Write an enzyme that holds these catalytic residues in place. Structure first.
Site, short mmCIF file in Angstrom:
data_model
loop_
_atom_site.label_atom_id
_atom_site.label_comp_id
_atom_site.label_asym_id
_atom_site.label_seq_id
_atom_site.Cartn_x
_atom_site.Cartn_y
_atom_site.Cartn_z
N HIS A 192 37.93 46.91 39.21
CA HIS A 192 39.37 46.87 37.82
C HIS A 192 38.06 45.66 36.90
CE1 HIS A 192 39.11 43.13 40.72
NE2 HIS A 192 39.48 42.03 40.11
N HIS A 235 38.69 42.49 35.78
CA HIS A 235 38.37 41.03 35.45
C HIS A 235 37.11 41.10 35.01
CE1 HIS A 235 42.38 39.88 37.71
NE2 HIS A 235 42.87 40.25 36.78
N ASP A 295 34.56 38.95 36.27
CA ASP A 295 34.25 38.71 37.60
C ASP A 295 33.42 40.54 37.66
OD1 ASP A 295 36.52 38.44 38.40
OD2 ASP A 295 35.90 38.19 40.36
N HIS A 296 33.83 40.75 37.36
CA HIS A 296 33.26 42.14 37.76
C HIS A 296 33.38 42.61 36.51
CE1 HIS A 296 34.91 41.60 41.71
NE2 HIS A 296 35.96 41.40 40.99
N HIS A 326 46.15 44.27 42.23
CA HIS A 326 45.27 42.79 42.05
C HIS A 326 45.41 43.04 40.06
CE1 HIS A 326 42.39 39.61 41.75
NE2 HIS A 326 41.87 40.43 41.03
N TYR A 353 48.95 34.58 42.38
CA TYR A 353 50.33 35.33 41.79
C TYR A 353 50.96 35.21 42.34
CZ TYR A 353 46.25 38.49 40.91
OH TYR A 353 45.21 39.30 40.23
N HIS A 391 34.13 42.08 45.98
CA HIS A 391 33.68 40.90 47.02
C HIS A 391 33.41 41.07 48.34
CE1 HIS A 391 34.97 38.35 43.76
NE2 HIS A 391 35.52 38.67 43.36
C1 LIG Z 1 40.53 35.58 39.37
C2 LIG Z 1 39.30 35.61 39.59
C3 LIG Z 1 38.08 34.74 39.16
C4 LIG Z 1 39.08 35.34 41.13
C5 LIG Z 1 39.08 33.42 40.97
C6 LIG Z 1 39.10 33.33 42.69
C7 LIG Z 1 39.56 34.22 43.50
C8 LIG Z 1 39.46 35.65 43.68
C9 LIG Z 1 39.66 36.55 44.23
C10 LIG Z 1 39.40 36.52 45.92
C11 LIG Z 1 40.55 35.88 46.67
C12 LIG Z 1 40.39 36.12 48.15
C13 LIG Z 1 39.01 36.20 48.81
C14 LIG Z 1 38.68 36.47 50.08
S1 LIG Z 1 39.81 38.26 51.15
C15 LIG Z 1 38.66 38.11 52.86
O1 LIG Z 1 38.53 39.06 50.34
O2 LIG Z 1 40.57 38.32 51.76
C16 LIG Z 1 38.37 36.69 47.75
CL1 LIG Z 1 36.81 37.26 48.13
C17 LIG Z 1 38.25 36.73 46.61
C18 LIG Z 1 39.47 37.51 43.67
C19 LIG Z 1 39.47 39.12 43.84
O3 LIG Z 1 39.70 39.54 45.07
O4 LIG Z 1 38.92 40.31 43.02
N1 LIG Z 1 38.80 37.22 42.23
C20 LIG Z 1 39.61 35.68 42.15
ZN LIG Z 2 40.30 40.47 39.51
ZN LIG Z 3 37.32 39.46 41.77
#
Ligand SMILES: CC(C)c1cccc2c(-c3ccc(CS(C)(=O)=O)c(Cl)c3)c(C(=O)O)[nH]c12
Ligand SMILES: [Zn+2]
Ligand SMILES: [Zn+2]
Ligand SMILES: CC(C)c1cccc2c(-c3ccc(CS(C)(=O)=O)c(Cl)c3)c(C(=O)O)[nH]c12
Ligand SMILES: CC(C)c1cccc2c(-c3ccc(CS(C)(=O)=O)c(Cl)c3)c(C(=O)O)[nH]c12
Ligand SMILES: CC(C)c1cccc2c(-c3ccc(CS(C)(=O)=O)c(Cl)c3)c(C(=O)O)[nH]c12
Ligand SMILES: [Zn+2]
Ligand SMILES: [Zn+2]
Ligand SMILES: [Zn+2]
Ligand SMILES: [Zn+2]
Ligand SMILES: [Zn+2]
Ligand SMILES: [Zn+2]
Lengths: 266, 266, 266, 266
Positions: free
Chosen positions: B83, B85, B87-88, B159, B190, B224
């Site tokens: 996706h 965002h 960070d990806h 997401h 969210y 992640h």
């Molecule tokens: C908007 C961006 C900068 C951001 C900011 C902050 C967190 C995320 C996550 C995210 C949420 C929960 C978990 C715990 S878990 C075991 O995986 O449920 C994980 Cl690892 C990651 C994600 C994402 O999921 O992409 N993005 C984030």
């Molecule tokens: Zn994301």
């Molecule tokens: Zn992410």
């Protein structure tokens, strides 16, 4: 061991972000930005024009000052830009979402705006902002008319390839006032000579000095007010010390020549 | 008096930015990102595919790891995304400038990528990155083939509207390995219920849980790694504890149901 | 009573659409378009460059001629353009979909390409074609290097704002050959004087005549071969009668001056 | 020998291009297109909405009919689309240039609009039109409010991936009238089964039949009026024979099932 660095937002002097109430320049023309970033509102019977918006976080403040002037979001018809760096076009995308405004810009400014200032010829990705699309592409010398105020584009490439001066005639005390909103002529940290991303940079700056010198110019304004010796915090004397366009061009050229000499020595 | 706030870059946990050497997942598939952000290199006789790139500042590290694998910039043919965002997809624009790579993405991901993650349905302008254009728009279930590796898109909106799982078959020890790169199923901060910008958010997440549960999935990877219980720093046992796709979907749905209940109570 | 007119495709002389086999210009440079539209293939050890593609329906023919030359779709790295009208950039979008090629163009050409030639300054929507995105924006005098062949952009605005000449050095009989691919200098049906969409049209054409006159130019080629007195159907003597860049510029300026005089009289 | 074919404009039945005067549907809703292409004007105290514009050559006729209704170019605030084919979105780019209107569309429609209908999943480049940018991306079920009329988007993918029904409540004779502008459900010349560019085509059409059947629907309108049994040339009885949404969905599904059976046999 050592992680990659965190992203760094470009932080600016606090005065660049200091809100101010609207300051009248002429009968229809107001400064509505911050103490140290110009954002000009031109009000006509047929809607309003905004020239520059400053930094990205200024959108709500601009809308507040428009409302103070009687300009609702639907009344903002047109956004014009000096150049598409983050400190002047920063809030354009948000303003387009929140108002009726359409953007008119030259092709160079349009492509830089559409990539949110990324891949800047000199700054790389160091000063990005939310991207926006231009609705109208303008050519050098083209006019745009809003509620009977005629804005003329004068290209003055250098600070960015798309740098533009905008001129229009307002009134004050029953008499015409030819306003020139001339773009930046600085080259902050730029490689001027032999730049592979801008091979004719020096030629473009020299032509732009000549363009600025010759603008119709009873009153000069600039995106950074200090460049034209405006002091927006000085109230009734904010514009008293403003440079002529000729003096602005001469000062910019002298600074540029000094920078060129230092670059040769460095 | 009080200036507007400075822009704030989103800062991430240091492990998200900690470079790692390439870690082999299967015969042609390598993790080449950071300890806590996935970036998958798939190497074929006809060029390479990158699935995600992590944060914007990871571009040079990715290119270094590609070079370590025998992949030159001209050899990178295709970028796919989970996706769009920051960070990806953060380094996608720079990777396109520095390699032969073209981007394939669904329409939702393409429009979010093209605005650099600005005007996010949930984050606003809080997590922007350099915009990039998609070269190919893919539909749900569409396949893309590179050097004989077939990638299938499985839309799993939630997401982000454009969230996508990518599946392909690699080999290991002479036997097929069905790899599923399933997108995030988190909803960090969210508003889930009655969100005016995403009215069918809950329905889309529930469908996406079902999609993930049913993926062809000998090996699950996630953007992640912690979401699928990978530990990229654990070497030969990095994937030992990885979840199945079924378990990942079940865990995400249980977390989602808890978040919904907390939202109702809050 | 009377329906609105049907849309009319712009139909061209049949010779513009007459396929030809590759015609060698120099050691690495081939004409691979039609009898009356130039499309230049430059072949290097590190991939191929295409300069112009002609009309939209020429994509498959171009790919056939590339294959005849040993250039597969993955080998085409770069598309450059003279200007972004339908009869020169027509197949660019399709070529990008079917090859590895990325487009480099100046900002003016990029914005016209991205709107598929619509809202043309002179032709309106009369000559549209499939839109395409540029991957790299080039500045005047910027160089691009592919497999050791160096292409230099020389802006020559007028026929379109973004009109560009491209120059490179090839070899023939062991000796350097400076090739100049100079853009059109025609103004077919244009309003030259006082054009609100192009106020400095005449000044730009006059500067462009001077630019063309001064190009490094052992061999001149033009998008319409007749403009430089090439006859692609004449085999071993196709280029025998070709104009110098000086003669091309002089002829274009004399025609332009005649058109200006007729416009004043009409 | 044999030149490549000339480009062919898609020519339509003359009734598709036959101008008509505005035909009132409800208190604020008017048909202002041609006899056989719908273009709906919704007039509010806070500006006007246009839903579809028909073919590219209809722009001036639409503006004439808007003027007849009291809607100036500045008063047109919003353009919504059923789907982004040339016969419904054709004049959007020109309308944006000539009015204050901004476009709201879903991501699929936005990307197809931005490429002017080129690279169509089924028609290739056979039906292109001037590209336009969307100003707002809408999600399924999202509402947009103009002068107190609330428009709700209902995605109904199939005819295009981005096909959308728009619903709103107007009044007539003091009573609410729930208007449903449902998109096309035809598949003209489409490969339905196993289409690599649209693998879930059949599933999407079946879901879209169910969506249309369930719309709030006192009055059904469709982009091609014949699909809902409207006769715009029949004056006071133009809508007398109009189908319900249920009947439209049932008829479309029966036709679709017949086409599927013929495809299996062909
Ligand atoms: C908007 C961006 C900068 C951001 C900011 C902050 C967190 C995320 C996550 C995210 C949420 C929960 C978990 C715990 S878990 C075991 O995986 O449920 C994980 Cl690892 C990651 C994600 C994402 O999921 O992409 N993005 C984030
Ligand atoms: Zn994301
Ligand atoms: Zn992410
Ligand atoms: C890239 C952005 C974030 C940036 C960062 C830092 C500085 C600038 C300037 C600039 C340079 C010189 C002067 C002194 S002076 C009397 O005007 O010569 C002034 Cl006021 C402003 C400018 C600009 O000129 O736009 N932009 C800057
Ligand atoms: C807009 C497009 C479809 C179009 C349509 C029609 C003509 C042209 C020309 C053009 C003009 C004059 C000459 C005679 S000459 C010895 O070269 O002066 C030539 Cl060969 C070509 C051009 C162009 O120049 O690109 N484009 C045209
Ligand atoms: C790609 C474009 C140019 C095109 C070309 C040709 C036909 C269509 C139709 C279409 C199909 C069937 C019906 C008969 S019916 C009672 O409605 O089933 C109708 Cl009226 C219209 C459509 C459309 O549906 O949008 N588009 C077409
Ligand atoms: Zn600047
Ligand atoms: Zn500045
Ligand atoms: Zn041309
Ligand atoms: Zn031409
Ligand atoms: Zn259609
Ligand atoms: Zn249609």
């Amino acid at each position: 061991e050592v992680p990659l660095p965190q992203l760094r937002a470009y932080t600016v002097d606090a005065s660049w972000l200091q809100p101010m109430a609207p300051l009248q320049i002429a009968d229809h023309t107001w400064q509505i930005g911050t103490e140290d970033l110009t954002a000009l509102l031109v009000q006509t019977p047929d809607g309003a024009v905004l020239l520059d918006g400053g930094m990205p976080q200024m959108a709500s403040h601009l809308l507040d000052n428009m409302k103070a002037r009687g300009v609702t979001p639907r009344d903002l018809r047109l956004i014009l830009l000096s150049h598409a760096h983050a400190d002047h076009a920063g809030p354009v995308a948000e303003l387009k979402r929140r108002t009726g405004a359409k953007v008119a810009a030259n092709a160079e400014s349009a492509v830089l705006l559409a990539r949110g200032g990324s891949d800047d010829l000199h700054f790389g990705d160091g000063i990005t902002y939310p991207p926006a699309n231009a609705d109208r592409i303008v050519m050098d010398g083209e006019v745009i008319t809003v509620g009977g105020i005629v804005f003329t584009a004068h290209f003055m490439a250098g600070h960015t390839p798309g740098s533009t001066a905008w001129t229009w005639t307002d009134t004050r005390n029953g008499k015409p006032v030819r306003i020139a909103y001339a773009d930046s002529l600085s080259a902050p940290g730029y490689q001027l000579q032999g730049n592979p991303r801008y091979p004719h940079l020096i030629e473009d700056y020299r032509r732009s000095f000549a363009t600025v010198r010759a603008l119709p110019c009873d009153v000069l304004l600039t995106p950074h007010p200090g460049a034209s010796n405006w002091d927006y915090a000085a109230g009734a004397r904010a514009g008293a010390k403003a440079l002529t366009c000729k003096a602005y061009a001469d000062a910019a050229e002298q600074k540029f020549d000094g920078q060129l000499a230092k670059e040769t020595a460095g």
